[PDB]
């Protein structure tokens, strides 16, 4: 496993999001978010994205990364403050 620290994993997620931004402003978002990736490990998602051959799947992973990153920031906020 990558055995990367929480901050390290977050940094990688941001880099992937920046590399391939996904606005999802189009209807393409619908039918894609239904995919369950929150249960996929960080390493699994990384491999999935690299091996991803579908744009829909790529967007799904990007969405999971954004949501995961958001939660991470919120968690840190609680420990850092309040």
């Amino acid at each position: 496993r990558p055995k990367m620290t929480p901050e390290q994993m977050a940094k990688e997620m941001s880099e992937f999001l920046s590399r391939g931004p996904a606005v999802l402003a189009t209807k393409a978002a619908a039918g894609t978010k239904k995919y369950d990736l929150s249960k996929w490990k960080y390493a699994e998602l990384r491999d999935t994205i690299n091996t991803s051959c579908d744009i829909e799947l790529l967007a799904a992973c990007r969405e999971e990364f954004h949501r995961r990153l958001k939660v991470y920031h919120a968690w840190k906020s609680k420990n850092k403050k309040r």
Partner: peptide, 16 residues
């Protein structure tokens, strides 16, 4: 404890 929670957030997709 806390570290484990962060790991889950960026691994298991847990809320923390």
């Amino acid at each position: 404890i806390e570290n484990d929670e962060a790991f889950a957030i960026l691994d298991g997709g847990a809320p923390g």
